[PDB]
């Protein structure tokens, strides 16, 4: 059966004749957010004059990569985060901040020297470093999905 | 092995936490969501709080005493012989001797020193398995390690030894559709095979 | 409610046909086996005897037993039914002409009750198997394992999902009728039934009568001993002679519809997962022949299939993105094999 | 001396458990089959029914038959036992919960007696085979051939070589108890046994009583019909509910120990020895698949193995010093092949 011989990762049902979960290629997705959901810029803390560094980067799929960040805030509150580079995939969307504290997040990468920017609510930073291979690879599918030239 | 299942617990309304008893390969897993048909339809009046705790450990078969493979670490030892000499005019001595080149055996009238032989090929390998009469110069994995299904899934020091190593991959599953029984999902033994997919 | 299918019961009779190897050879058994169906999965076969067991002639107790002895029924107890194959089967239920029974595989099918004075069985050829649904090729259903959608027949009778045509019987022979009137061959009648009669010589040419004589012929062996007795319809067996007059009514249901039961079903022992560099060694050890298969999830599928009954250490070149793994009807596994070569 | 194992007899009862394919489907048969052991060689299987046949309830005659009907035993005659598999087996002996029977190979095991009103059988899956010990792979023991050390179970009972734990039963359901007191649900007791009782509503919460009523609830289907009746222990079946109180005593032997009987055993027809120059042509013609093998006695072993069932002319490059030859469990031969090339 095609749910046992298909390519590019599909599952099947005698139901509307779907082929579920076919992981292949990309999708050009575009959203119109409600502007009410936005927070104006003058209310989130400005975080610059910070510092970022890995502490135990795991060169892996599960979110084993970690990095403290010397947060240098202005106000105190939440701060959404993301790596605009696809090198690093982060488990935390948002980090809470006191007045210029420090909070580690989790992530995963594919390049031995992860030189990925991190955009902590309008403040970029390179979390450069080096990572370690794991040992224990027999469980379902990854969060990394960013393999490239390394 | 013999999956000599101890009879599962069935608490009727609420959980029964299991503990890891020290039986060899004591597999035990609590289960809920039953409605156990036992001779009167079900008997526990709840419907999800009906709890069933299955437990199963591995134990030596009764055949383990008698029909059993047997590993060995084999060194060289010392070879023997019932050497007859119908000597000279003596005409007889049938004596058991050794090979080590200073042992006499004054059985009869003659004193005789044998060996040591130069041909030290012990046809036994270092590691050997033994079965009844068929001897297998097999690299048995070890006590304490044998992968389930593979040879030595059960590994008892001797027959008396209550302790053992039972990697059988014994995995209990929940009984079906509110009925009393014990799904034990297990590899038939690496002693079952090793009797019909063995070596010569 | 055993009283909801008088469609068949009142109106159908226990038919008698020609069993093929009826103990000795081709007899005419009332339990003549047609339409063997070893097409389900659950160890079950639905069978049709030409005999209509169930209620009696009149109104009571499914668990009684009406076959044809003579021109006549014999609506009595079911005491010692035996369906069997390579081994003795297990009855499941009877309704009408039809019985459901849990059988093992068998080259043939072999049926029979015991009236009490005689064995009186009937036997037939039919290729039977029981694959359970699943990638495990057992020979028999276990006590445990996963449930999954098998095909199987019901226990019950309150059933209309299909109906087979059951119109009249044709005539039948009965030379017990053709006695002798001390010089002439003498026909009689069951109960005023319609006896269709003439002999090779010229005498009465139709026969729709009470007990007639025969003026012309003398020998019993040259006359038409017939029974147009169409007060009760029959199953339209291939081993029936047509009732030449008409397609009478008698559309009649089937009890044992094939239904989407979830059989208590198969399960193969768990695998021994072993790591290597982008490679699954799997020492494996099943109970029965298990169809293993995989799907390397690249757009290069590169699948594999092999029934495994002999324990086997196998290998799978897993790629970077993943592979999946299907130990029988045990659920499909999945695996991240990124690097391990440091 | 059938009176030496009142360890089991007096103190154990015929247990009842859930047979998996009990004719129709999963019933609760007293002869519920656990621990099938097709592990010996002699065509024999040792089985445990949950039923304890043997002596009666009290004291007499191994060849009687006590299963559970109701909460109660029924210690009566064994008249029509049937163990069977692919074919009908042959009983060997019963003792306690346990029966030994000579069976052929079979994908399953299928057991059953006949009480007299009903067939009342029980059936189970178990992979069975019977290899005889020997390099011949028969399907069945012959009348003749060599004797050699097989594994096999005894006929007898005077047996202590092992013992299995047999502590109490847990409770059991019996909704025949929960009658109605004309508006309230009414429990009773067997003989003063310990009935463990309450309903979903709030009423009597333990139940250690004679026949109680139920003030609060009314429906039979929401109450605890239980029988703590631990006057006789049981086998510790997986299909038993635990007696939650304690690990009571009741260590109890096994009769049918596996013993080192020398089965009457196999033998393959003699070979046809044919000479050639340092070479044994052997036209060969077995009865059954025979594992032949040899040992070229040089320090170069160069052995060979092949099961032979199809008659085959084979060859063996014999050396100067010798070879040996093993036509099945027929004894090993030996051969001088010096020159023959002159």
From Swiss-Prot, chains C, D:
Residues 1-342 are extracellular. Palmitoylated via thioester bonds. These palmitoylations may induce disruption of the C-terminus transmembrane. This would result in the reorientation of E2 C-terminus from lumenal to cytoplasmic side. N-glycosylated. It is found in: Virion membrane; Host cell membrane. It is a single-pass type I membrane protein. It comes from the Viruses. Plays a role in viral attachment to target host cell, by binding to the cell receptor. Synthesized as a p62 precursor which is processed by furin at the cell membrane just before virion budding, giving rise to E2-E1 heterodimer. The p62-E1 heterodimer is stable, whereas E2-E1 is unstable and dissociate at low pH. p62 is processed at the last step, presumably to avoid E1 fusion activation before its final export to cell surface. Processing of the precursor of protein E3/E2 into E2 and E3 results in a heterodimer of the spike glycoproteins E2 and E1. Spike at virion surface are constituted of three E2-E1 heterodimers. Interacts with 6K protein. This is Spike glycoprotein E2. The chain holds residues 325 to 666 of 1242 of the full protein.
